[PDB]
Design a protein around this ligand. Structure first.
Ligand code: ADP
Ligand code: ADP
Ligand code: 0TF
Ligand code: MG
Ligand code: MG
Length: 353
């Protein structure tokens, strides 16, 4: 039995904990927040700030199999970079890839340097899409029909938002499974479903990882626009939401793959359907789709229900949010599970949908 130490107990932390448990690992969480969202979901919870008390983390490293940073606190990441040689287990992270992926302008220069199409900067005609250079979860992302001078302003590319993860070991780059990112009126993601192989997106994602070169995990997001595929961002960190869909739809556990990349290496290259989504139980049980930004304001997140083909997680807070995961052999079986899972909320809580 392996043990993984997660630094960060919010959405990334949840995804990593979830897949770690599927792999049969024990999950130790470190988080500076005594109310960390998944503090009760992990097997052990240590509350400390790793920048203030790095000796505690270094000591933990002596008794787990890997440390996985799952936060986007740049002070945390850079500090961990500074002490990484002192760890007694592998740190599953690519610090140089993260430096590029975290800054959207730098990422766009990287795309251009390798010939990868990306949305036009500073179009002369609306709509524009504007976003901060260094956020995630579509925080500050808006369509527009005095921004800070650093705001990204791009052509608005209409079409499907599609995601692919890549795990590299420095030499080989394992391109995993395409997923559709379903977006809400805030441009946040409320649902994810799997997509058929897309050889162009796969080669692009391969070359993005290969040119870094990636030793770790990164996801690549693109819009299938009217004039072709345009890469909008990369993120060299463990993602949320998509890895669960990747797990049911493809049978690949991104945590086990990432761990392999730092131990024996990875090699390049199921076909089930899965629906992953978030629903808030708003005033008198009207179910409303919500994105991650909503889920991340919760106080407590853990397993609510499971039966064959159905898992439900409850994120407590100002209005309960349910994360629902349905899977099955095709869309039809999965759609049936989604119905059964909704009726579990319908009969239990008087939910409406
Ligand atoms: N230095 C740190 N030590 C321990 N936990 C940390 C540190 N920095 C961030 N975290 C934890 O990682 C989690 C995710 O952080 P972050 O990615 O910055 O998300 P957010 O901006 O939504 O709070 C949080 O629960 C945070 O408390
Ligand atoms: N140029 C664009 N045109 C149209 N939609 C976009 C564009 N850039 C981003 N988006 C939308 O906004 C969301 C957030 O963009 P992204 O670049 O992924 O920032 P974040 O790091 O927050 O995810 C995307 O999933 C997509 O829905
Ligand atoms: N592969 C597609 C990924 C799209 C998106 N769902 C995502 O990974 N979001 C990461 C947000 C995490 C914010 C914060 N660092 C936290 O951990 O809560
Ligand atoms: Mg992003
Ligand atoms: Mg994004």
């Amino acid at each position: 039995m392996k043990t993984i130490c997660l630094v960060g107990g919010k959405l990334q932390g949840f995804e990593a904990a979830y897949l770690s448990k599927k792999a049969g690992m024990k999950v130790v969480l470190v988080d500076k927040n005594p109310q960390a969202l998944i503090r009760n979901y992990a097997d052990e919870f240590y509350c400390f700030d790793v920048i203030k008390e790095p000796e505690k983390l270094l000591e933990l490293s002596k008794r787990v199999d890997a440390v996985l940073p799952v936060n986007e606190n740049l002070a945390c990441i850079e500090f961990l970079n500074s002490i990484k040689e002192k760890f007694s287990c592998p740190v599953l992270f690519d610090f140089e890839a993260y430096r590029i992926s975290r800054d959207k302008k730098k990422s766009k220069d990287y795309f251009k340097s390798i010939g990868v199409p990306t949305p036009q900067d500073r179009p002369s005609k609306p709509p524009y899409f504007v976003k901060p250079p260094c956020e995630s979860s579509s925080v500050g992302a808006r369509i527009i029909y005095g921004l800070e001078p650093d705001t990204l302003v791009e052509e608005y590319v209409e079409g499907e938002v599609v995601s692919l993860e890549v795990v590299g070991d420095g030499s080989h780059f394992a391109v995993v499974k395409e997923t559709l990112v379903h977006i809400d009126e805030t441009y946040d993601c409320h649902m994810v479903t799997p997509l058929p192989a897309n050889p162009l997106f796969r080669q692009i994602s391969h070359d993005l990882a290969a040119n870094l070169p990636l030793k770790g995990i990164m996801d690549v997001e693109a819009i299938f626009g009217p004039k072709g595929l345009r890469v909008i961002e990369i993120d060299a960190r463990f993602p949320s939401q998509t890895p669960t869909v990747v797990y049911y739809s493809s049978g690949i556990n991104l945590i086990e793959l990432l761990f392999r990349a730092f131990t024996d290496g990875v090699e390049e290259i199921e076909n089930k359907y899965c629906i992953y989504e978030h629903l808030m139980f708003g005033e008198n049980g009207v179910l409303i789709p919500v994105g991650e930004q909503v889920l991340s304001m919760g106080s407590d997140y853990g397993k609510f229900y499971e039966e064959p083909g159905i898992e439900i997680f409850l994120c407590k807070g100002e209005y309960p949010v349910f994360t629902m995961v349905f899977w099955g052999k095709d869309r039809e079986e999965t759609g049936a599970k989604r119905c059964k899972g909704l009726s579990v909320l319908k009969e239990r809580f008087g939910a409406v949908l």
